[PDB]
């Protein structure tokens, strides 16, 4: 296949395992240390889930111009 | 000029205002979150403000090879 292209690809798998991979372990530790605290006033334990469902969010927008 | 590049730059510039932005606003309301158990046990607060120096370093690394 003649076209020349090493900037088309492996970024959607690049960019998954690539950042969640490490961005997925604080919201464990953290999953705990607000479950604590989720007790006198859960509201923080889901304010820590929430931005983990807008860090989803995210990385399927600013990924939409990395292909 | 003549040489033909459309995806050497505006990303520096754009990879901090573009997920920085965004990814800043959840320390904060998580800022309060944490504090307030803080007391009960500090740890947690920090360990979030910590996961963020971690997130400027995680920044600077991916970006190293998006120039």
């Given at each position: 296949?003649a076209?020349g ?5 492996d970024?959607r798998?690049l960019?998954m395992?690539?950042?969640?991979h490490?961005l997925?372990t ?13 007790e006198?006033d859960?509201y ?6 929430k931005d983990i469902e807008?860090?989803?969010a995210?990385?399927?927008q600013?990924i939409?111009?990395?292909?």
């Amino acid at each position: 296949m003649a076209a020349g292209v090493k900037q088309l690809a492996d970024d959607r798998t690049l960019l998954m395992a690539g950042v969640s991979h490490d961005l997925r372990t604080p919201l464990t530790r953290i999953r705990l240390a607000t479950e604590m605290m989720s007790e006198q006033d859960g509201y923080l334990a889901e304010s820590i889930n929430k931005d983990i469902e807008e860090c989803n969010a995210i990385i399927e927008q600013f990924i939409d111009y990395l292909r």
